[PDB]
Amino acid sequence: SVPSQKTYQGSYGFRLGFLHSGTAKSVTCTYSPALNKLFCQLAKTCPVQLWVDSTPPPGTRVRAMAIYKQSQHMTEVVRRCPHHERCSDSDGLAPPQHLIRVEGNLRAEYLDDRNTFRHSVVVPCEPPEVGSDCTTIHYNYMCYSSCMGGMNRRPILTIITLEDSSGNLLGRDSFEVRVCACPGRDRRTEEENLRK
Numbered sequence: 001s002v003p004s005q006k007t008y009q010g011s012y013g014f015r016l017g018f019l020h021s022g023t024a025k026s027v028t029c030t031y032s033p034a035l036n037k038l039f040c041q042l043a044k045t046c047p048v049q050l051w052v053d054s055t056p057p058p059g060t061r062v063r064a065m066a067i068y069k070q071s072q073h074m075t076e077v078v079r080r081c082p083h084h085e086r087c088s089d090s091d092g093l094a095p096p097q098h099l100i101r102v103e104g105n106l107r108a109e110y111l112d113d114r115n116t117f118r119h120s121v122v123v124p125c126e127p128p129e130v131g132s133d134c135t136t137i138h139y140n141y142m143c144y145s146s147c148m149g150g151m152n153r154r155p156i157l158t159i160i161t162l163e164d165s166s167g168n169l170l171g172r173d174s175f176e177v178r179v180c181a182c183p184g185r186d187r188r189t190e191e192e193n194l195r196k
């Protein structure tokens, strides 16, 4: 099977937001609205904003999962490559096979789905800090898009789902991800290709 990627704001008006980081050579994470694509360095902080129009109930959670973007690869589980799964870079909570980690949240839970074998990471919803209008989750991607025996140059999507306490769908959004050494240059190149 394949997880749905259909954008769905749902009853709470759920959607993502991204910072405006630019495309300088030194940038470690940058989002392209024209491509709906995040470009980031390996294991660096990727701030993703969560926005709602109304407050979801206590017990609502936010889950992240990666799938391959190309249809001919969509049924294959996205996982870390044979090198990175063995490099003992554990944070003490994320299984070493998981591509996506949540940084700085001791309530993050990592799931290996017993039926689909897909990986995901889920956190409880928390209200914005006083003075803020949205909540941010900090993600890390733990392999390069190019890693041999893993993503192997195949593009991926991240699907972010807002879920109730039982895991039922409340909202969904998604974005493509490229994990690469020079996200600013790659964003500029791909946006130029799109303009041409």
Ligand SMILES: CCCCOc1cc(C(=O)O)c(O)c(I)c1-n1cccc1
Pocket (backbone or CB within 6 Å): 050, 051, 052, 054, 055, 056, 057, 058, 059, 060, 062, 124, 125, 126, 127, 128, 133, 134, 135
């Ligand atoms: C108590 C559990 C539910 C609390 O979740 C939110 C509340 C508000 C609010 O304004 O009360 C909000 O703005 C956001 I963004 C979230 N939220 C959504 C996903 C992650 C956090």
Ligand SMILES: [Zn+2]
Pocket (backbone or CB within 6 Å): 080, 081, 082, 083, 084, 085, 142, 143, 144, 147, 148, 150
């Ligand atoms: Zn790797």
